[PDB]
Amino acid sequence: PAPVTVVGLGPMGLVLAEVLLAKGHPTTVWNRTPERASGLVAQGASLAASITDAVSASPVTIMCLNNYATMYEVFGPAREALRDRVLVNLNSGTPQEVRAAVSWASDLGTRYLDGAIMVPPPLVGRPDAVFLYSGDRAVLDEHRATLASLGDPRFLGADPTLAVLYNTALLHMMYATLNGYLQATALVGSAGVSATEFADIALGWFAPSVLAPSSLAAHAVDLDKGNYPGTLGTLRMNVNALEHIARAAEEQGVHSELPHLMREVAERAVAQGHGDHNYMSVYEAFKQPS
Amino acid sequence: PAPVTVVGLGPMGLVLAEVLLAKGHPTTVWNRTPERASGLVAQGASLAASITDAVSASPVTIMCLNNYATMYEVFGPAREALRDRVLVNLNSGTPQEVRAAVSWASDLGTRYLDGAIMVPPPLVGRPDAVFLYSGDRAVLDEHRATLASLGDPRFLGADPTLAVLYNTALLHMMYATLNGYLQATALVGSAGVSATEFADIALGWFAPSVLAPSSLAAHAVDLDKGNYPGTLGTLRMNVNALEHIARAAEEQGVHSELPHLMREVAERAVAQGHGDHNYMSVYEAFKQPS
Ligand SMILES: NC(=O)C1=CN([C@@H]2O[C@H](COP(=O)(O)OP(=O)(O)OC[C@H]3O[C@@H](n4cnc5c(N)ncnc54)[C@H](OP(=O)(O)O)[C@@H]3O)[C@@H](O)[C@H]2O)C=CC1
Ligand SMILES: NC(=O)C1=CN([C@@H]2O[C@H](COP(=O)(O)OP(=O)(O)OC[C@H]3O[C@@H](n4cnc5c(N)ncnc54)[C@H](OP(=O)(O)O)[C@@H]3O)[C@@H](O)[C@H]2O)C=CC1
Numbered sequence A, B: 001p002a003p004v005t006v007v008g009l010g011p012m013g014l015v016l017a018e019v020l021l022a023k024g025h026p027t028t029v030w031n032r033t034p035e036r037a038s039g040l041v042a043q044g045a046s047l048a049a050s051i052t053d054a055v056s057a058s059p060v061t062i063m064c065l066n067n068y069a070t071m072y073e074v075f076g077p078a079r080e081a082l083r084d085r086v087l088v089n090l091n092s093g094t095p096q097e098v099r100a101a102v103s104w105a106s107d108l109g110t111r112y113l114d115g116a117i118m119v120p121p122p123l124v125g126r127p128d129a130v131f132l133y134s135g136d137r138a139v140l141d142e143h144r145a146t147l148a149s150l151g152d153p154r155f156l157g158a159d160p161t162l163a164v165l166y167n168t169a170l171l172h173m174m175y176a177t178l179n180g181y182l183q184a185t186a187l188v189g190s191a192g193v194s195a196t197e198f199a200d201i202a203l204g205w206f207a208p209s210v211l212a213p214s215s216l217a218a219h220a221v222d223l224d225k226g227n228y229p230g231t232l233g234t235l236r237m238n239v240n241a242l243e244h245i246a247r248a249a250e251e252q253g254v255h256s257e258l259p260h261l262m263r264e265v266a267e268r269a270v271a272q273g274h275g276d277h278n279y280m281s282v283y284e285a286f287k288q289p290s
């Protein structure tokens, strides 16, 4: 197991280092506040005296800092140490932040690979914990054994922004679906229906029959074509149901802003000529900036 | 097939009457604007001269009006005629509207059964189109043959508010989940990723592994207890992800209001001491009025 450097000992960075150490890697760590490395040092990690020392200690530096902006401040003194070394950026963020980092890394002559972690810190190190990677495939192939110690590395393609972008898109789907479930549970709960009683109907019947992933996936080809046949249900009729949902949430005394905004966004699609189309035409409203 | 009355000839009421007619029921219809019955009359329906005549024409009256307030205005002159007759209320609405309707119906001496339609008008009449019912089960048992002509009648319980409440809750889950999928597709599409490439990843891997209905159902018992252990991931960490999602949508030029509001609502539960708890603790924010 090759030597590795971890820069950033927040909750995520601490677990990345702990796992690399447990998997046998000689691990050098660096953090602005050195006391965060106390437990790691007891486990066999080496606390670097400086960012340059940390970068020079290993062929690979894995960074996990609060934001992309922090990277420039932290790695400033280690710019020459980064030359001909590997920098794996596991920070979450946006495509604009990744493009700037890729340009900075190219100017320094460092081999850069951007990634995104799909799990919270306690799930890192498990064989099913997905880490997305995108950019220079050669970095992943050469340092595969090290990255595989953290979980399941999945390379998405040459575009370096893919990992962070897919992280935000997939996580958005998760939060929207969980919020839908929580809002519905709070709505029936306002009338004395228990969460478990509601799960019998909602998750036992409704969600498997109406919201099966393969059913949502069948709409994908039509989303790419902008084809939204409403022969079996139109957006205008869906708007009427959204109006009832929002008024119910409000009258029942549970959260009503998200229901009102969903009604408003569907109305925008109606205003732009999608009244006859199926509900998926609201994709046209999701494509437009707010 | 027994005689039936349909009151309300909007897009849904027109199809309820058309299906009852096709299934052989002698069908009497009434609407404030009588010209809506033109096609139904050509199909063999009888246009009632008045609301009293409509109610008196059949043992069962099925109503499908825009709102519950309309019911009092429409059925006012037929109040005495409604005594000892059956009124099936298929309007969508809220629990407060249903409780008031149940009280009004009890005072009139009419047998009342509230319901909710889970499909759009073109799917009515099919054996799998679900119609929810709640309240007096004896009404459903006695008039099951007529209601079964419209689709699959599903009785939820004695509480008359259940059908409308479940309609709004389940539909909210469907819209939230579809919107999550569309927002995510628009976000990756801003970087040149096609809807089909993304759907294969998000729905082929992510949704079955993270959002399986049985996994959401396992949270239900803890939602009822208010138990949200954050040992495997905290709400504060999920809020950091929600911030990147909103910033990504904004920078990418796609819809960002829904992502910003979801971040805001999760922050409200953090402000109330749920920062260290798991994501499902945002249920406490969904229970709060806006
Ligand atoms: N936690 C999670 O669930 C997940 C996190 N991520 C991502 O991992 C990254 C790290 O997250 P996490 O560990 O949770 O905690 P944070 O996002 O809060 O990052 C904390 C780290 O940033 C350092 N830091 C902050 N400000 C500065 C500064 N001005 N100068 C130097 N160092 C600074 C901290 O140092 P110090 O200790 O000295 O304050 C610490 O090492 C983030 O990009 C996050 O989005 C990805 C997936 C899941
Ligand atoms: N359409 C759908 O996809 C679904 C609809 N529903 C529910 O079915 C019900 C009917 O819906 P829908 O058919 O789509 O259309 P609407 O909700 O717009 O209701 C139209 C009906 O209401 C009548 N009406 C409106 N205002 C008055 C008034 N002041 N006095 C008398 N009658 C009035 C109309 O009469 P007039 O023609 O004279 O204007 C017409 O018969 C609603 O509760 C809806 O939520 C349920 C599931 C799906």
Ligand code: NA
Pocket (backbone or CB within 6 Å): A089, A090, A091, A092, A093, A114, A115, A116, A163, A164
């Ligand atoms: Na990254």
Ligand code: NA
Pocket (backbone or CB within 6 Å): B089, B090, B091, B092, B093, B114, B115, B116, B163, B164
């Ligand atoms: Na009803």
